[PDB]
Amino acid sequence: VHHDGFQTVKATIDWEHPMFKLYEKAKRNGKWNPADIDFSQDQKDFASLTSEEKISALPLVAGFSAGEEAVTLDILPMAHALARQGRLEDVLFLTTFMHDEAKHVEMFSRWQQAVGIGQMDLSVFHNDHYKRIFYEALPEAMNRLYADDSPEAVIRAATVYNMIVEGTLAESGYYTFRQIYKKAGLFPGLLQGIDYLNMDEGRHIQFGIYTIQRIVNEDERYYELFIRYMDELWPHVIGYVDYLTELGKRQQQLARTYALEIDYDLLRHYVIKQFNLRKKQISRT
């Protein structure tokens, strides 16, 4: 359907818009290129491992690789809906968001290829709770926006994508990676990538907070909606976290070898702390 006019011909960009400022920061802090990461030491580390130790790291990489790919495809409807509402500054920022996610997909796929498991199908480490979030609830909530861009729909979309998938699972995943392999001195390439990813992610979560708050600010009843949608998803979050935990406890050999006391109680409490923390970044009033 037609354009009825253009903001940068009638006027200019709104230079003070928060999403314009986030867009500017994204350009400044988003220069990194996964193609420049040296994975040669990672390949050696990985080949040095025994079959049992090799397996230990694959579940987390499988969750991240699919997750990056899901959110690369699934952010498009949000960019469309805000574009249709004429929110030009949001759209400019969302171009950096999508390009960040493309690079994240690229990074993990390069690591898989370099250590020699590209040919392996890592879908085996996706349980029913993971599928419910990433194969189903995420794409349902985003695609909805094509036909329903009400405040309710936009809140639910940002909640699932930015507050749960990024704000709870991704963040806890980054913490988990450092706690385990950074201590072990393993996989320097991959951890360089995790550091870059974790930096991009801060802007992604800030877009979600901004999006949810600006809708809550019009009607403080949407706040209840936010909390409700957070709680609906919690069972699948913790059901994926318990499942990974259980794989971790059964496959002890990497941890013994590298003298890592892998505190799964602490990882679990970090996930719980992330979830409650995101809730607190939205003010009812």
Ligand X SMILES: CCCCCCCCCCCCCCCC(=O)O
> Which residues carry a binding-site annotation for Fe(3+)?
68, 101, 104, 129, 161, 166, 201, 204
| Nearest distance from C-beta of residue 285 to ligand X, angstroms | 29
* Binding site, annotated residues for Mn(2+): 68, 101, 104, 129, 166, 201, 204
**CA angle, corner 38, sides to 34 and 43, nearest 5?**
115
For residue 15, the SS3 value is coil
User: Of Fe ion, a second copy, ligand X, none, which one sits near residue 43, judging by CB under 5 to 8 A according to partner kind?
Assistant: none
Q: Is 204 in the site for Fe ion (CB under 5 A)?
A: yes
- The residue (of 42 and 68) whose beta carbon lies closer to Fe ion is 68
| Nearest distance from C-beta of residue 136 to ligand X, angstroms | 14
User: Of Mn ion, a second copy, Fe ion, none, which one sits near residue 73, judging by CB under 5 to 8 A according to partner kind?
Assistant: a second copy
User: Nearest Cα to 104, choosing from 197, 27, 32, 189?
Assistant: 197
Find the helix packing angle between 188-216 and 151-158, rounded to 10°: 160
Q: Is 74 in the site for Fe ion (CB under 5 A)?
A: no
Distance CA 185, CA 23 (A): 35
Binding residues among 233-262 for Mn ion as defined by CB under 5 A: none
Integer CA distances (angstroms), 119 to 24, 114, 116, 208, in order? 39, 11, 8, 35
Give the x-and-dash track for 132-171 against Fe ion (CB under 5 A): ----------------------------------x-----
| Nearest distance from C-beta of residue 109 to a second copy, angstroms | 4
User: Of ligand X, Fe ion, Mn ion, none, which one sits near residue 115, judging by CB under 5 to 8 A according to partner kind?
Assistant: none
Binding residues among 150-189 for Mn ion as defined by CB under 5 A: none
- Out of 19, 23, 155, 187, the residue judged to bind a second copy by CB under 8 A: 23
Q: Is 22 in the site for ligand X (CB under 6 A)?
A: no
User: Nearest Cα to 60, choosing from 262, 273, 272?
Assistant: 262
How many other C-beta atoms are found inside a 10 Å radius of the C-beta of residue 117?
A: 16
- The alpha carbon of 244 is separated from its chain's Cα centroid by a whole number of angstroms, namely 17
Which residue, chain included where needed, has tokens 């990056």?
68
Distance CA 144, CA 78 (A): 10
Binding residues among 24-53 for a second copy as defined by CB under 8 A: 24, 27-28, 31, 33, 35
Using CB atoms within 10 A of its CB, is residue 11 exposed (0-12), middle (13-18) or buried (19+)? exposed
| Nearest distance from C-beta of residue 40 to ligand X, angstroms | 25
Find the helix packing angle between 40-48 and 88-115, rounded to 10°: 50
Q: Is 285 in the site for a second copy (CB under 8 A)?
A: no
Q: Is 170 in the site for ligand X (CB under 6 A)?
A: yes
User: Of Mn ion, a second copy, ligand X, none, which one sits near residue 1, judging by CB under 5 to 8 A according to partner kind?
Assistant: a second copy
Residues 62, 132 contacting (CB under 8 angstroms): no
Which residues of this chain interact with Mn ion, rule CB under 5 A? 68, 101, 104
